[PDB]
């Protein structure tokens, strides 16, 4: 697709037979979800944002579908106020910014 | 231009007659820049993200160039760790996500 930015660029994602939605976030290095369904073992990671730093749960080698495009990469579970797909996964689906 | 996402999408901006650099962030509703003076009167605003909230000054109807492309809109100023161009201005220059 070619997605304009008049509203938040939320898209359907699928992980482990759960459908969720998440924002395509060019300002995020990482992909951060509030929760995943029974994802298992993880390691701690710190990330930052405008308000400070948060501790998150890092899961590697996650198979995800983003708007029907298959990808694999790291997903963080943490206290983000909106689920976000960051550049680690945007690159995998060939996403660019264009103007 | 077409901007791939293997690194942060930092671009040149011009605001207040000064060249700066800022992150094009599709996960930002609004534009937030580090402390500067701007013309006109400001009003106080809160914005949120990862790690919590921050206090900013809101300036309306500000001229900004983003890679030479003119926009006019709201610019927030405050203690952000990086200058961020959000959707309020990305839309004005016709920026889209493409995959």
């Amino acid at each position: 697709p070619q997605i304009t930015l008049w509203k938040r660029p939320l898209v359907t994602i699928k992980i482990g037979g759960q459908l969720k939605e998440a924002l395509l976030d060019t300002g995020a290095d990482d992909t951060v979800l509030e929760e995943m369904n029974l994802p298992g073992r993880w390691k701690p990671k710190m990330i930052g944002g405008i308000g400070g730093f948060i501790k998150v749960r890092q899961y590697d080698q996650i198979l995800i579908e983003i708007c029907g495009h298959k990808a694999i990469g790291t997903v963080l579970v943490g206290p983000t106020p909106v689920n976000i797909i960051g550049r680690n996964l945007l690159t995998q689906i060939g996403c660019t910014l264009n103007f | 231009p077409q901007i791939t996402l293997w690194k942060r999408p930092l671009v040149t901006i011009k605001i207040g007659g000064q060249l700066k650099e800022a992150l094009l962030d599709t996960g930002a509703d609004d534009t937030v820049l580090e402390e500067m003076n701007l013309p006109g009167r400001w009003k106080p605003k809160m914005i949120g993200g990862i790690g919590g909230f921050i206090k900013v000054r809101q300036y309306d109807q500000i001229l900004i160039e983003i890679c030479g492309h003119k926009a006019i809109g709201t610019v927030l100023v405050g203690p952000t760790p990086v200058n961020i161009i959000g959707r309020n201005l990305l839309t004005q220059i016709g920026c889209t996500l493409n995959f």
Binding site: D29, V32, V82, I84, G86 | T26, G27, D30, I50, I84
Partner: peptide, 6 residues
């Protein structure tokens, strides 16, 4: 608003 991750 919301501004998103380093």
């Amino acid at each position: 608003x919301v501004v998103x991750a380093x």
